Structures are given as structure tokens and as C-alpha cells.
Design a protein around this ligand. Structure first.
Ligand code: ADP
Ligand code: ADP
Ligand code: ADP
Ligand code: K
Ligand code: K
Ligand code: K
Ligand code: MG
Ligand code: MG
Ligand code: MG
Lengths: 329, 329, 329
């Protein structure tokens, strides 16, 4: 029948999402998984392990199953989707739609399918994240109109020119959210001589981070370890200095856009001026990222609604398409 | 019986038309056909492929089945008329009237017949496009009065002196719509340093193109790729500069008219002054093309109604003639 | 019986006429016959081919069956009278009266009879055109009174002194209508540097041609090919310059009249002063040709009524005479 079960997965570097047809997104948690480093046993995953990063003894190993679409830890990758498939095992012929970044090789994608199949998958389908992100952002990719999708995730900023449902031009760079957190951590050590964890650096980016000055920007207090005294030390950080370090981090992302537009066919480039840039992903939540991209490229920039879910929302829309590609052909 | 099915085809370089007796023109779409360059499979044809030219990855091959009446792609030519014959297969002894330009050799015309026969044609008839265009423009070619037919198509400008239903003098040159689009593209690159696709160049010719200044000519905005910055760039183009580049493109067409009239018998040349020039085809829609031809040759110039359909409308009229040539003789 | 069918023919260089007893002139059309030069097949004859002269491709051969009474084309001559005999075949013992110019040899006249007999003629009679033209002009040739008949046809100007029903003195020259058309064509090329066809040159002679200035002579517009530019060119031509070129063309006809009167017996020459000159044929329609001949020879000149039909009208009158020569003798 056509009521066949359907599951799609966003195996992101920072957040893992799982959509089930008829039940919505049943799983949406960070990718961190805590393991007992003495017994190689699973301790926690999702939020329970994400609240412990930087707060664990050496006997607790923090693991990310997938980094930039590639299986970073085989034991963790299959432990993750076993937890997801078990909540589907307890409700038999589900369709497994995987979304893979453009940088994943075919050899690594066959590994993603087998790991899914090894844990109990019958039919595994792989689609490009860019067209999934474009579907979740509201673009009708079937139309012959060029669109520019910028997906700023946890460890990869993915760029793609999409027209007629295909990736005309594609670029990728390993500079994203995790790189922004490290630069914030390294800046606060060079400017205030205070060591902070990755979690504090990430919360600063979310609370006061921006690329253009916004209305009534506030300053927040950090709490870390003093390099000089060794004792815990406090510090006040303004939104401006967080903006200047994000400005510097976006330097390698901006030139990639120049390189993507350099090799874009002239008829597509015409559509980019009228259709514009669509920024999606976690990095799309940077304050005034639309005005920042507009001020540089003179291109109209819009932020997709629920940018975190553009990939998993696109797989929602693409379920009726793969069922056509399965029932037919 | 005399109610035998009848189909005629305009296999033009830019537009393909198909007339069925009793149903009118059932097919009228551009010639572009999109093929999967990895599997050599047909993806789209007509408008679906025409909206994608300049907007496709390298894995999509854009194909024109016939260029200037000659089979440019064997696989595409038979894929095209199979799509047309199928819509006739689903409604058995149809007459296939083909209209061929004057530049097609008899060896290439036998290929056009066999390809039609190979896909299921029983009786294939070939007629000259010039007399078909003259029939579709309102000329009674049976009368002993000379007429000058200028057919400006996609890739060929065809000239013919017609009298008593025969081609007295004939000339042809491979300078037409596609040459005009390229010159517009090359002018906008040399004047504004902006690369545009073929589709934008064609729309400029249709929206503001002309050969003589017309009432309240407007300027339009193009959108392409900047040669210098590599980013998409906008430009404003007036109707005057588009007129001057069309003026230069029509230089090789004007001297061909001089050459056609140079070798025209003196009694025919007398009729050309009184009957005049009949401009038909897509290029006949150039604004003030009648006044432009009149200012050069001092010959009265008239634009045929529905110049795009002069060939397919002429085959409509010539159905009762070929039935006479079939039932008799 | 005496109700035997009777057909007479005027196989002129310019016009072919056919009279049937009891039905009048059933055929009266120009001599031009159009043939497919690739298949030697008959395409058209009469007016249909006359409207195409100078307006045909090289694959269409224009043929005149008889030039100056001699079979110019054997295939065309028998194709012509087969078309005439067929309209008599569909209504069985007809009398075939042929009128032959004085320049036709007996060997060529036997060819005219056999070609008629080869297509289905039983009894073929040949008579002199001059006495037939004299009968059609109203002269009672049986009377012993001398008359001067000037027959200006398409390619021959025939002169004869007729008395008692016999040709006393006869002269002929190959200068007539076709020579006048060529001189008009050659004059318009030398005076205006414009090439015109034979049809335009003939219509000028008919519309404004004359030998003496007439009342309210007009100027007409020609349309031909310019020698310099190669483009069609217009020109205005007055009746005076057309008169001066006809005056020069009639130079060789005038001296022939002097030569005919030089060898005319003195008793006949006396009758020429009182009876006068009778001008018949197409050339008799030249405006003021009677006053022109009168001003030169001081001889009274009269134009025969329906000068084009003087030969075929004379054969009408000579039917009762040949029936006497057949029933008796
Ligand atoms: N409000 C916010 N402001 C700035 N950055 C954010 C915000 N929310 C999330 N992020 C960043 O976005 C990243 C997660 O986005 P996502 O596209 O789900 O990553 P991935 O697809 O790689 O798993 C996190 O690393 C986080 O640092
Ligand atoms: N309004 C217009 N103004 C100028 N050019 C036009 C217009 N409409 C069509 N054309 C040109 O005419 C061409 C198509 O005319 P057509 O005679 O159908 O070509 P073909 O017969 O070779 O297929 C196209 O290439 C297009 O560029
Ligand atoms: N109105 C006219 N004025 C001057 N010439 C004429 C006129 N009508 C006919 N003709 C000439 O007379 C010729 C035909 O006369 P006709 O005696 O029938 O010729 P033929 O007897 O040789 O066939 C034509 O060649 C034409 O040029
Ligand atoms: K994610
Ligand atoms: K066409
Ligand atoms: K005649
Ligand atoms: Mg992502
Ligand atoms: Mg055409
Ligand atoms: Mg005659």
C-alpha cells in the first residue's frame, strides 16, 4: 500500500532530528553522546550528555556520531539510530530517507546506508541536504528559477545554487558554529586572560552574537578560570566585541560566496539578484545576518522560518515525491 | 476516401509546429529538448526545456533536433515527432506534409522522410517553406504575379521570389534570431562588462528591439554576471543601443536582398515594386521592420499577420492541393 | 452532303485562331506554350502561358509552335492543334483550311498538312493569308481592281497586290510586332538604363504607341530592373519617344512598300491611287498608322475593322468557295 511507514533523519553535527510520517518530529536533540571511557558503555545522549560537556571526568568520553555528514564514531552512530529505531520498533517496512551534505563521498554514504541497514533498515534513500533545506525554507525547487541557499550548521557552511530541483553550483567550507564558539573562546582568553568552556562560548554567541549592530544590545557576564590566578574569574563582554570576532570568522565564508557566484552561469546570476539569498540553519539566527549579507553582495537576503528545521521540514515535503519515485519507476 | 488523416509539420530551428486536419495546431512549442547527459534519457521538451536553457548542470544536455532544416540530432529528431505522432496515435493512414527550407539537400530530405517513416509514417510529402510561408501570409501563389518573401526564423533568413506557384529566385543566409541574440549578448559584454544568458538576450530583442525608432521606446533592466567582480550585476539598456546592434546585424541580410534582386528577371522586378515585400517569421515582429526595409529598397513592405505561423498556416491551405495531387496523378 | 464540317486556322506568330462552321471562332489565344523543361511535358498554353513569359524559372520552357508560318517546334505544333481538334473531337469529316504566309516553302507547307493529318485530319487545304486577310478586310478580291494589303503581324509584315483574286506582286520582311517590342526594350535600356521584360515592352506599344502625334497623348510608368543599382526601378515614358522609336522601326517596312510599288504593273499602280492601302493585323492598331502611310506615299490608307481577325474572317467567307472547289472539280 501507499500508507508505508516513512522516517527521515537530519544527522547534523550539532543537532539530530527524526521525522516520522503521521507523528511529526519525534526526536530533536543535540548530537553529543557520553560514554564510559573505562567500559565503552553508553551513558547518555542528547540533552543529558550536552549538559555535561566540559563538566566530566576523564572517565567520561564525549562523542559526536557524525561530523560534517561523515561517520565520526561507528559505535556511536549505530547506538544513536538504534535509539531512534527502537522508539519506532515499538510503534515494519519503513522508508529511510537520509539527507547528506555535499561533501560526503559515495563511499561514506554507502556506510551511512549499511549502518542503517545493519540496525534494521530495509530501504534507505539518500538526498542532498541543500534541496531538502530549500524545501524546508519555502522554495519551490521544481521551478526554473535560481535560488542561493546558505546552510550554516555546526561544523559546515554549505552553499548551493538550486534551479529546477538540481544543484547547479555547490561550495562548502568547514567554518560554522563550532568554529565561532572556538574563536569566542580564544578571543576571551587573549583579551581577558580567562579560560571558558565550549558551552559558555556557545551561549554568548546565542545571547549577544550578531554581525550588524542591533537595537539595544546588552552585555553579559561570563564565568571561567583565570589564567593568572588559577581561581574562577568573572568578566563583562559587550555585544560589539562579540560582533567583531564573528565579523572576522565570516571572512572565509564571504569569499566562498564570491567563489560560488564566480562560477555561476550568467542566467542563474540574474535570478540571484531578484530571488536573493536564503539563509537557513542554526547560523541563520545570528542577529542581522540578512543585513550583513545584503551590505556585502548587494543581494536581497531573507532568513528562513525555523531555520534549524529546514532540512527536516524539507524531508517532510519530499515524502510524497519519493513515494512517487518508489511506487513508479 | 478523401477524409484521410492529414498532418503537417513546421520543424523550425526555434519553434516546432504541428497541424492536424480537423483539430488545428495541436503542438506549438520551442525546439529545445533537455537530455540527461549521463543516461542519454529524455528529460523534457518544448517549454519545460526552454525555461531551463542556461540554468542547467553539466549533466543536462540541451539539444535542438533540427538546425536550419537539417537533422542536427538523430535521437532528438525521432524523439520529437514520436511525441507528436503518439498524440495522433491516440486519436492510421495520415498524410505527412513536411516543409523544408531551400538550403536542405535532397540527401538530408530523404533522411527527414525516413525518420518520419521509421516512427510510423506511410506517405511523407516535402514542400518548400517559402511557398508555404507565402500561402500563410495571404499570397495567391497560383497567380502570375511576383512576390518577395523574407522569412526571418531562428537560424536562417530565407528569401524567395515567388510567381505562378514556383520559386523563381532563391537566396539564404545563416543570420537570424539566434545571431541577433548572440550579438546582443556580445554587445552587453563589450559595453557594460556583464555576461548574460541567451534567454535574457532574446527577451531584450522582443521587449525593446527595433530597426527604426518607435513611439515611446522604453529602457529595460538586465541581470547577469559581472566580469570584474564575479558577482551578479544589473544594467539599464535603452532601446536605441539595441536598435544600433540590430542595424549592424541586418547588414548581411540587406546585401542578400540586393543579390536576390540583382539576379531577378526584369519582369519580376517590375512586380516587386507594385506588390512589394512580405516579411514573415519571428523576425518579422521586429518593430518597424517594414519601414526599415522600405527606407532602404524604396519597396513597399508589409508584415504578415501571425508571422510565426505563416509556414504552418500555408500547409493548412495546401492540404486540398496535395489531396488533388494524391487522388489524381 | 454539303453540311460537311469545316475548320479554318490562323496559326499566327502572336495569336492562334480557330473558326468552326456553325460555331464561330471557338479558339483565340496567344501562341505561347509553357513546357516543363525537365520532363518535356505540356504545362499551359494560350493565356495561361502568356501571363508567365519573363516570369518563369529555368525549368519552364516557353515555346512558340509556329514562327512566320514555319513549324518552329514540332512537339508544340501538334500539341496545339490536338487541343483544338479535341474540342472538335468532342462535338468526323471536317475540312481543314490552313492559311499560310507567302514566305512558307512548299516543303514546309507539306509539313503543316502532315502534322494536321497525323493528329486526325482527312482533307487539308492551304490558302494564301494575303487573300484571306483581304477577304476579312472587306475587299471583293474577285473583282479586277488592284488593292494593297499590308499585314503587320507578330514577326512578319506581309505586303501583297491583289487583283482578280490572285497575288500579282508580293513582298515580305521579318520586321513586325516582336521587333517593335525589342526596340522598345532596347531603347528603354539605352535611354533610362532600366531592363524591362517583353511583356512590359509590348504593353507600352499598345497603350501609348503611335506613328503620328494623336490627341491628348499620355505618359505611362514602367517597372523594371535597374542596370546600375540592381534594384527594381521606375521610369516615366512619354508617347513621343515611343513614337520616335516606332518611326525608326518602320524604316525597313516603308522601303519595302517602295519596292513592292516599284515592281507593280502600271495598270495596278493606277488602282492603288484610287483604291488605296488596306492595313490589317495587330500592327494596324498603331495609332495614326493610316495618316502615317498617307503622309509618305500620298496613298489613301484605311484600317480594316477587327484587324486581328482579318485572316480568320476571310476563311469564314472562303468556306462557300472551297465547298464549290470540293463538290465541283
Ligand atoms: N540563536 C542562535 N544564534 C547563533 N547561533 C546559533 C543559534 N542557535 C543555534 N546556533 C548554532 O547553530 C548550530 C546548530 O545548527 P544546525 O543547523 O542544527 O547544525 P547542524 O545542522 O550542523 O546540526 C549550533 O552549533 C549553534 O552554535
Ligand atoms: N516579438 C519578437 N521580436 C523579435 N524577435 C522575435 C519575436 N518573437 C520571436 N522572435 C524571434 O523569432 C524566432 C522564431 O521565429 P520562427 O520563424 O518560429 O523561427 P523558426 O521558423 O526558425 O523556428 C526566435 O528565435 C525569436 O528570437
Ligand atoms: N493595340 C495594339 N497596338 C499596337 N500593337 C498591337 C496592338 N494589338 C496587338 N498588337 C501587336 O500585334 C501582334 C499580333 O497581331 P496578329 O496579326 O494577330 O499577329 P500574328 O498574325 O502574327 O499572330 C502582337 O505581336 C502585338 O504586339
Ligand atoms: K541539524
Ligand atoms: K517555426
Ligand atoms: K494571328
Ligand atoms: Mg545542518
Ligand atoms: Mg521558419
Ligand atoms: Mg497574321
Amino acid at each position: 500500500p501507499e500508507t508505508r511507514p516513512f522516517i527521515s533523519l537530519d544527522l547534523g553535527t550539532a543537532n539530530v532530528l527524526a521525522y516520522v510520517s503521521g507523528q511529526g518530529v519525534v526526536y530533536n536533540e543535540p548530537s553529543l553522546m557520553a560514554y564510559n571511557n573505562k567500559t565503552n558503555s553508553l551513558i547518555a545522549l542528547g540533552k543529558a550528555a550536552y549538559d555535561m560537556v566540559g563538566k566530566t571526568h576523564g572517565d567520561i568520553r564525549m562523542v559526536t556520531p557524525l561530523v560534517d555528514g561523515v561517520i565520526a564514531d561507528m559505535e556511536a552512530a549505530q547506538d544513536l539510530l538504534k535509539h531512534i529505531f527502537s522508539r519506532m520498533k515499538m510503534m515494519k517496512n519503513a522508508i529511510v530517507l537520509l539527507a547528506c551534505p555535499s561533501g560526503v563521498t559515495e563511499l561514506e554514504r554507502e556506510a551511512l546506508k549499511n549502518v542503517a541497514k545493519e540496525m534494521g533498515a530495509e530501504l534507505v534513500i539518500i538526498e542532498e541536504e541543500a534541496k531538502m533545506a530549500a524545501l524546508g525554507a519555502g522554495i519551490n525547487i521544481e521551478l526554473p528559477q535560481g535560488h542561493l541557499i546558505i546552510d550554516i550548521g555546526g561544523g559546515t557552511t554549505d552553499l548551493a545554487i538550486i534551479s529546477s530541483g538540481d544543484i547547479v553550483v555547490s561550495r562548502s567550507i568547514k567554518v560554522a558554529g563550532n568554529h565561532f564558539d572556538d574563536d569566542i573562546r580564544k578571543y576571551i582568553r587573549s583579551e581577558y586572560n580567562i579560560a571558558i568552556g565550549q558551552k559558555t562560548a556557545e551561549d554568548v554567541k546565542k545571547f549577544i552574537g550578531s554581525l550588524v549592530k542591533y537595537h539595544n544590545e546588552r552585555s553579559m557576564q561570563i564565568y571561567g578560570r583565570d589564567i593568572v590566578s588559577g581561581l574562577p574569574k568573572e568578566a563583562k563582554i559587550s555585544s560589539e566585541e562579540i560582533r567583531n570576532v564573528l565579523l572576522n570568522a565570516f571572512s572565509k565564508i564571504t569569499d566562498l560566496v564570491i567563489e560560488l557566484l564566480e562560477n555561476t552561469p550568467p542566467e542563474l546570476a540574474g535570478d540571484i539578484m531578484r530571488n536573493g539569498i536564503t539563509v537557513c540553519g542554526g547560523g541563520a539566527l545570528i542577529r542581522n545576518i540578512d543585513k550583513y549579507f545584503f551590505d556585502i553582495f548587494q543581494l536581497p537576503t531573507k532568513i528562513a522560518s525555523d531555520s534549524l528545521n529546514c532540512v527536516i521540514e524539507g524531508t517532510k515535503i519530499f515524502e510524497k515525491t519519493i513515494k512517487k519515485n518508489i511506487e513508479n519507476g
